[PDB]
């Protein structure tokens, strides 16, 4: 008597992983509970990630297109920018959503427990109750509840990676800060050339900042095919002053007149630079080491992930882990899927994460979208492939939409001739890789995709045309192998 | 000695059908010739259809979105409209394209013969040479060439259906006129509620006209699922004064102060109406009866089509027919596919148009996209189906893009559980039905599509979510069958 509660399944985290696992299990007739330390469900993705970033990226995109339409004799002056209202529009999509999740938990009879959860023992969660209403600003009530579970689905996600030498200062922000829209900096450093920051960067440049980007690696969007990035970098090169790649941020020293940062590398200003703001988008660390997993017997990697098996099970059989905490690629769509397999095992169904492919998407302008085998992956595994690329320069619709600089690339298993990879650089790329997606899942071949009558004039049909080019049958391009 | 020429294959028409058939055959090592009465290839689709309509529809769409972004505190005044430059922008995508086709024929060594072709006998085309440079304005030189062929691919397309009682007047236009952009009428009647006119209508309303639409049928976009149209009609109802459906246009009498037209029906103004212009978008007639097909022994329906077999062959074995002349749905993507099968038969490969599904797309706002089985088709065949609908109201991305009024609908064979239909109302609908496309072509099931990890947040993933709803597994919506 005090604070103890018993459940079938207890999902630690109410992110994309967690509330999907939770509502699934729930859906199975299981008595489930979500332990979320903030009061809104949806996790990072709904609250300080996927959705506000993309709502913002969509406004920015429309203001860049009006810049273009002039030339078609459609004329507008610069827009009046209200960030109080911009800001609130984002907060609006988000709360609309968070409000619905909530409602959905109620309806599913799932219990949301607001509190940081920590493992007591293999069948007990110690919940240190928490109070607050704003995602990321919740505080411990001092009160504590003991929750017991048949099963537990750990879904505690990851967190922004902090660089050790970067000092604190209101002007050094991570992406939750950037998503704050406190103001458009006149000059913004972006540490890290990965998708998140280039996505942040794009909204700020279009709202007015001039950006610099620092990437320790050889390039931007590490992990996508350089041919694709090439197209992206060509079209946005004008948004940056300096695309400092293969360069080290060494000094970061805040001054009364902005943050002064020194870089080490090549094509790196030897003169320390000044910015009105610096966006640290250096990566994300998983939270396995912060839940006292050792008290449930759950094993955690030194890096912080909880390796798990195709069933989402951890070394502790009644304890499953899903989402970013489990491993890369840290993406909400990955997490929802692992989310359903672990909920099903919990309901005693035998489920394997069996999907062979997970999509990555930079929702920049243009969007860089890819799946399955990539040339580099292939080149790494020295897998033998057949890539079929269709240039948008040949596409009536891209020419009409003024995006003929992009293309669709389909890669095939050179032995089987089966599709195993897909890359799309161009507007809606992410709305279109889902078919090279299902394609790969159905084990289709170039004749499979190619004989599919895709509609014209569209961007979508370059998947088909890339297939005919595979088949050497495209009559919209010069003859192949004469 | 005069004008005679011998070829393997002679494609009558340089439309989407024809130049695809022509470049394919060509691609097979065959000696081919395109007989096109205008000087630009691409046919109606490139020149007075698909492409200019869609280039126009894309400018209009961006000006309607800027109307929306105000509310996000992004503020613009009405745009300055230059139709001389608008006009020329369209002409620019188009000639860019037509210029390339040309170049492609040269490179493929295909001969373009500019002249109206008429059958002499089963192996001879009489070509009455023609002169002009503007699509649709070509004139007969009086000179004539006799072309002989192993094979002939008839690809002569269709033409705007003229209503008998409509008088002539610069103010009564068909879609080539509307595509002229001679001026935004203050008031525009639209005879026919089909895709072409509603597409024409949308650009004009957004450029400023107030529209009225007359449809003899029970609705708009006849042939799509009413649930889909419903969504489209709800969102554009404000562009029309009168959506006169189930109504007859009886009088059409031009006056000094505009075209006065009387309608017969219900909710039809008993007072004859005045418009500054009337768009006759009543349908399209195929041209089989206008090529002296009877001289090749080719049989033509009284309606004007050339029925053909899965090999594109007509009753005359060495004579094939493709595209709109062959049958509905008259769509450029259909024609390119039939186009490749007839070219392959010509090269002695045995080819069947074997695709089981052809996409229809109104590129309006929102776009209405569908494939395969539709509820009405099903209801007609009394096929027994399973539809899975996913509301965009539940989609983070649609909410963020402000299109949560649309949805994705997947229909399944109730016996086999196989997908056989797909409908998508919403922006990019046509860029997304290609996966419910390949889906249907691969004979996928709801578990097939559903376990496909589509990326989030996107519009694309509602195909997947519609699948889980089929599976009763969607955790983004209230539980299914509790
Ligand atoms: C700016 C940004 C934009 C992104 N955009 C996208 C995108 O467009 N598409 C995409 O696929 N992904 C993108 N990502 C990825 C990210 O949204 C998803 O990978 C992530 O949400 C996956 O869900 P998750 O379940 O594993 O965990 P989470 O998002 O991380 O949720 C974990 C939750 O559990 C709670 N929690 C953590 N520890 C405890 C504890 N001890 N006790 C109680 N509660 C706890 C936290 O409060 C948090 O709410 C984005 C990320 C960022 C940072
Ligand atoms: C405004 C409009 C917009 C459209 N938009 C699209 C769209 O977005 N997507 C889509 O799929 N379809 C849409 N359509 C459909 C239409 O473009 C295609 O169905 C049509 O181009 C298909 O190609 P076709 O080969 O059979 O013939 P065609 O377009 O009709 O070409 C026939 C050609 O052959 C020539 N010809 C005809 N008779 C003779 C003769 N006797 N001698 C010599 N030459 C001759 C004509 O000059 C013409 O160039 C649109 C149509 C219109 C009218």
For residue B38, what are the CA distances in angstroms to B85, B87, B134? 25, 21, 7
Q: Could you tell me the CA-to-CA distances from A77 to A67, A74, B452 in Å, in that order?
A: 9, 11, 44
Q: Is B324 in the pocket of ligand 2 (CB under 6 A)?
A: yes
Taking a C-beta distance cutoff of 8 angstroms, is the pair B426, B366 a contact? yes
- Beta strand pairing call for B258-264 and B248-255: antiparallel
Q: How far apart are CA B462 and CA B480, in angstroms?
A: 16
Strands, DSSP E only, in A161-316? Answer: 172-173, 187-191, 210-214, 240-244, 248-255, 258-264, 273-275, 277-280, 284-286
Instruction: Name the CATH code of domain B4-55+83-159+285-346 (choices 3.30.420.480, 3.50.50.60, 1.20.140.10, 3.40.50.920).
Output: 3.50.50.60
Residue with tokens 């996505």: A199
Please, are residues A19 and A34 in contact by the beta-carbon 8 Å criterion?
Answer: yes
- The whole-angstrom separation of Cα B23 and Cα B11 is 10
Interface test with A, best of B465, B475, B478 (most A CBs within 10 A): B475
Rounded to an integer, what distance in angstroms lies between the CA atom of residue A98 and that of residue A47? 8
B361 phi and psi angles, rounded to 5 deg: -150, 120
Spatial distance between the Cα atoms of A124 and A3, rounded to a whole number of angstroms: 12
B124 Cβ closer than 6 Å to some ligand 2 atom: no
Q: Ligand 2 centroid to B221 CA: how many Å?
A: 20
> Residue holding tokens 């009489």?
B126
Q: Which CATH class is domain A172-282?
A: alpha beta
CA distances, B285 to each of A444, B157, B191 (Å): 38, 9, 16
Is residue A386 within 8 A of residue A417, CB to CB? The reply is: yes
Distance CA A52, CA A95 (A): 10
Asked if residues B287 and B157 have their Cβ atoms less than 8 Å apart, the reply is yes
3-class DSSP assignment, residue B244:
strand
Give the residue among A190, A223, A201, A232 at the shortest CA–CA distance from A367: A232
A37 alpha carbon to ligand 2 midpoint, in Å? Answer: 61
Domain limits of chain A?
Answer: 4-55+83-159+285-346, 172-282, 366-471
What residue in B sits closest to A459 (Cα-Cα)? B431
Strands (DSSP E) found in B181-312: 187-191, 210-214, 240-244, 248-255, 258-264, 273-275, 277-280, 284-286
B60: phi then psi, degrees, rounded to nearest 5: -50, -55
Residue B84's CB is within 10 A of a number of other CB atoms, namely 8
Q: How far is CA A401 from CA A345, B206, B332, B403, in A?
A: 47, 18, 19, 20
Q: Six-digit token pair at A249? A: 């941020």
Query: How far is it, in rounded angstroms, from Cα B85 to Cα A70?
Result: 9
**Tokens 């489920």 -> residue:** A351
Token pair of A458 as six digits = 């569209």
Distance CA B303, CA B8 (A): 30
**Which residue carries 């240039």 as its tokens?**
A391
Q: Which two tokens stand for residue B106?
A: 């040269």
Nearest to A413 by CA among A434, A450, A449, A444: A444
φ, ψ (nearest 5 deg) of residue B279 = -100, 110
Q: Return d(Cα B331, Cα B57) in angstroms, integer.
A: 18
Rounded to the nearest 10 degrees, how much is the dihedral formed by the CA atoms of A247, A252, A256, A257?
10
DSSP assignment, residue B356? -
What CA–CA distances, in Å, run from B386 to A34, A92, A412, B411, B465? 33, 35, 34, 5, 15
First to last CA, chain B: 83
The two structure tokens encoding residue A311:
């069933």
What CA–CA distance (Å, rounded) separates A428 from A420? 21
Burial of B433 (0-12, 13-18, 19+ CB in 10 A): buried
Query: Given this structure, which CATH class describes domain A366-471?
Result: alpha beta
The H-or-E segment that residue B155 falls in is none
For ligand 2, whether the C-beta of B333 sits within 6 Å is: yes
CA of A44 to the centre of ligand 1 (A): 3
Task: Label residues B209-240 b or e (16+ Cβ within 10 Å = b).
Answer: bbbbbbbbeebbbbbbbbebbebbbebbeebb
CB A312 within 8 A of CB A341: yes
The protein residue with its alpha carbon nearest to ligand 1, atom 8, reads A50
Sign of CA pseudo-dihedral B308, B310, B311, B315: negative
Phi, psi angle pair for A371, to nearest 5°: -155, 160
A206, two tokens: 């279009």
| Residue B19 tokens, joined | 């130049």
Residue written as token pair 């006119």: B197
A265: left (phi over 0), alpha (psi -120 to 50) or beta: left
Binary contact (B461, A333; C-beta < 8 A): yes
- Treating both helix axes as pointing N-terminal to C-terminal, what angle do A429-441 and A462-471 enclose, rounded to 10 degrees? 50
Please count the other Cβ atoms lying within 10 Å of the Cβ belonging to residue A193. 25
For chain A, say whether B62 makes contact (Cβ under 8 Å). Answer: yes
Q: How far apart are CA A370 and CA A434, in angstroms?
A: 10
Residues in chain B, total: 482
Q: Cβ contacts of residue B380 below 8 Å, gap of 6+? A: none
Cβ of B470 less than 6 Å from ligand 2: no
Dihedral Cα A218, A223, A225, A227, nearest 10 deg: -40
**Residue located via tokens 């059409």:** B252
Q: Phi then psi for B419, rounded to 5 degrees?
A: -70, 140
CA distance B78 to B344: 53
Q: In terms of Cα–Cα distance, which of A362, A51, A49 is closest to A194?
A: A362
**DSSP letter for each residue of A123-176:** TEEEEEEEEEEETTEEEEEEEEEEEEEEEEEE---EEEPPPTTPPP-TTEE-HH
* Residue A255 CB-density burial (10 A; 0-12 exposed, 13-18 middle, 19+ buried): exposed
How many Å apart are CA A455 and CA B16, to the nearest integer? 13
Q: Which of B400, B462, B477 to mutate to test the interface with A (most CBs of A within 10 A)?
A: B400
**A371: its two tokens:** 């799946």
Chain A contacts in chain B segment 83-102 (CB below 8 A): 83-86, 88-89, 93, 96-97, 100
Identify the CA nearest to B162 among candidates B268, B68, B283.
Answer: B283
Angle at B75 between CA B71 and CA B79, to 5 degrees: 120
CB-CB contact of A311 with A114 (8 Å): no
Alpha-carbon span A228 to B370, nearest angstrom: 30
Which two three-digit tokens encode residue A435? 């078919």
Confirm whether A4-55+83-159+285-346 and A172-282 share one CATH topology: yes
The β-bridge partners of B445 are: B418
Do residues A362 and A220 touch, judged by C-beta distance below 8 A? no
- Contact present, B424 and A435 (Cβ < 8 Å): no
CA-to-CA separations, A337 to A167, B453, B458, B468, in angstroms, rounded: 38, 7, 16, 11
Residue A29 carries which DSSP code? T
């Amino acid at each position: 008597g005090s604070a103890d509660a018993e459940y079938d399944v207890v999902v630690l985290g109410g992110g994309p992983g967690g509330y999907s696992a939770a509502f699934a299990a729930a859906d199975e007739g299981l008595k489930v509970a979500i332990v979320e330390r903030y009061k809104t469900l949806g996790g990072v993705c709904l609250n300080v990630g996927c959705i506000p970033s993309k709502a913002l990226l969509h406004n920015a995109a429309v203001i860049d297109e009006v810049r273009h339409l002039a030339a078609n004799g459609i004329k507008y002056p610069e827009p009046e920018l209200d960030i109080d209202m911009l800001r609130a529009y984002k907060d609006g999509v988000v709360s609309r959503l968070t409000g619905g999740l909530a409602g959905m938990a109620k309806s599913r009879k799932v219990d949301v427990i607001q509190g940081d959860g920590q493992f007591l023992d293999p069948h007990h969660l110690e919940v240190s109750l928490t109070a607050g209403d704003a995602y990321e600003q919740a505080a411990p009530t001092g009160e504590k509840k003991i929750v017991a579970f048949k099963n537990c689905i750990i879904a505690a996600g990851s967190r922004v990676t902090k660089l050790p030498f970067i000092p604190e200062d209101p002007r050094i922000i991570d992406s939750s800060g950037a998503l704050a829209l406190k103001e458009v900096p006149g000059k913004l450093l972006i540490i890290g050339g990965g998708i998140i920051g280039l996505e942040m960067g794009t909204v700020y440049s279009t709202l007015g900042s001039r950006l610099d980007v620092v990437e320790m690696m050889d390039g931007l969007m590490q992990g996508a095919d350089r041919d694709l990035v090439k197209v992206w970098q060509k079209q946005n090169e004008y948004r940056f002053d300096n695309i400092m790649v293969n360069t080290k941020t060494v000094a970061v020293e805040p001054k009364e007149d902005g943050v002064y940062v020194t870089f080490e590398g090549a094509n790196a200003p030897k003169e320390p630079q000044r910015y009105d703001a610096v966006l640290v988008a250096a990566g994300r660390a998983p939270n396995g080491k912060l839940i006292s997993a050792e008290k449930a017997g759950v094993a955690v990697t030194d890096r912080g992930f909880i390796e798990v098996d195709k069933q989402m099970r951890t070394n502790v059989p009644h304890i499953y882990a899903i989402g970013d905490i489990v491993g890369q690629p840290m993406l909400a769509h990955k997490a929802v899927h692992e989310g359903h397999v672990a909920a099903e095992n919990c309901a005693g169904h035998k489920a394997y994460f069996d999907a062979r492919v997970i999509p990555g998407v930079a929702y920049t302008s243009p969007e860089v979208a890819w799946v399955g085998e990539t040339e580099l992956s292939a080149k790494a595994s020295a897998r033998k492939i057949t890539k079929a690329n269709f240039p948008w320069a040949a596409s009536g619709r891209a020419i009409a939409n003024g995006c003929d600089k992009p293309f669709t690339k389909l890669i095939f298993d050179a032995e089987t001739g089966r599709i195993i990879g897909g890359g799309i650089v161009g507007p809606n790329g992410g709305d279109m890789i889902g078919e090279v997606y299902l394609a790969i899942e159905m084990g289709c071949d170039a004749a499979d995709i190619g004989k599919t009558i895709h509609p014209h004039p569209t961007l979508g049909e370059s998947i088909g045309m890339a297939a005919e080019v595979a088949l050497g049958t495209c009559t919209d391009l010069p003859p192949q192998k004469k």
